[PDB]
Design a binder for this molecule. Structure first.
Ligand SMILES: CC(C)n1cnc(S(N)(=O)=O)c1
Ligand SMILES: CC(C)n1cnc(S(N)(=O)=O)c1
Length: 171
């Protein structure tokens, strides 16, 4: 069976228990922590691409009011995020299973830009999601996996200083 697991869940859970925040910039900012995924049960000889996207967890705008994150009362439909292709893609199952698949080069932006960057609505809450796409074979197949532990609010600067301190402590 195709098993997908989050590497460093212990560390993600420290961020999540504080409400995690990720910076977005016009040029794009890399994530900390980095999403690293443990994958087993691929065909070592089959061909796969690893895709990353961000699902809007709710339809609301969030604001840091008196030391606490609180959703707006005016929900709107959230357009789905664009997909980031892991740069090792396409690659053999063996490649993907020999070390954690690390999305260290994805950049989160708040502006429609050239290419590569993922465009996120600031003050929206996001749940990272991967797609494992079997390619080149006759039978195309997709397996998707969400990572609740990795939820965050896109922010142009850190609201909760406890997040700022954790980010520095573990980088
Ligand atoms: C606003 C943000 C979440 N977004 C960026 N691109 C999309 S799209 N056209 O649905 O791929 C949505
Ligand atoms: C640009 C606009 C959406 N915004 C206002 N404040 C933030 S912040 N620093 O992320 O809380 C973003």
């Amino acid at each position: 069976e195709l098993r997908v697991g989050l590497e460093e869940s212990e560390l993600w859970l420290r961020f999540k228990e504080l409400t995690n925040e990720m910076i977005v910039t016009k040029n794009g900012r890399r994530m900390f922590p980095v999403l690293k995924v443990n994958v087993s049960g691929l065909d070592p000889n089959a061909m796969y691409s690893f895709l990353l996207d961000f699902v809007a967890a709710d339809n609301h705008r969030w604001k840091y009011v008196n030391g606490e994150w609180v959703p707006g009362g005016k929900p709107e439909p959230q357009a789905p995020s664009c997909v980031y292709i892991h740069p090792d893609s396409p690659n053999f199952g063996a490649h993907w299973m020999k070390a954690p698949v690390s999305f260290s080069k994805v950049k989160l932006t708040n502006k429609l830009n050239g290419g590569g960057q993922i465009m996120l609505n600031s003050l929206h809450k996001y749940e990272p999601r991967i797609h494992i796409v079997r390619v080149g074979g006759p039978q195309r197949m997709i397996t998707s996996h969400c990572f609740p532990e990795t939820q965050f609010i896109a922010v142009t600067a850190y609201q909760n200083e406890e997040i700022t301190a954790l980010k520095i402590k573990y980088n």
